[PDB]
Structure 1
C-alpha cells in the first residue's frame, strides 16, 4: 500500500518517458503526409418600413455558439434592470448648484 516511493517513482518515470517521446517527435526530420438541450434559437423582429408599414421578421439561429452569446446578454440585461442616467445626473448637479447659489444669496 505504498504512499511514498511508489507515487514518487511512478511520477518520475512518466516524466522521463514524456520528455523522451517529445524529444524524438520534435527532432524527427521524417516527412509527415498531409491529412445539451438540442434546441435552436428563433427571434421575431417587428420594424416600420418607409412611408407606412409594419413587417415582422422571424430569424432562426442554428449556431449553438451564437445562441449562447446572444441569450447571455438578454439574461444579463434582464437582471440589469446609461446616457439617459448621465443626463439625469447632470440635471441633478445643476439643481444642486442652483440650490447652493440660493443658499449663498440667503447668507449674504
Structure 2
C-alpha cells in the first residue's frame, strides 16, 4: 500500500515477467497444430436493421419502387452517418 516502493516494485516485476514471456514465445521452435472464442455483438446496441424503400423511373414510362434491407450493422453505421451529416450540411 506504500506506493513509494510498492507501486514501483510491482509494476517493474510485472513488466519484467511480460518481457520474459514474450521472449519465450518468440524463441519457441515448438510446432503448433493447424476463430478463437470471442464475445458476439448484437446487430448494434438497439438490435435493429436498416431498410430503404426508394422510387425510380424505368425506360419508356414506369415508376417502380425498391425496398432494400441492410442487416449489416457496419454498413448501417457508415450509411446513417452520411445522412446525419448531409442533414446538417444544408
TM over 0.5, yes or no? yes
Q: CA RMSD in A?
A: 1.0
Distance 2:74 2:50 in 1: 11
Report which structure shows greater RCO (CA 8 Å, sep ≥6). Answer: 2
Unaligned runs of 5+ in 1: 82-108
Distance 2:31 2:46 in 1: 44
State the number of aligned residues: 81
Distance 1:45 1:34 in 2: 48
TM-score, with structure 2 as normaliser: 0.87
Runs of 4+ in 1 over 3 A off after TM superposition: none
Decide which structure has greater helix share: 1
Q: Corresponding residue for 1:6? A: 6
Unaligned runs of 5+ in 2: 36-44
Partner SS state of residue 74, structure 2: helix
Residue 3 (structure 1) shift: 1.9
Residue 45 (structure 1) shift: 1.1
Q: Corresponding residue for 1:60? A: 69
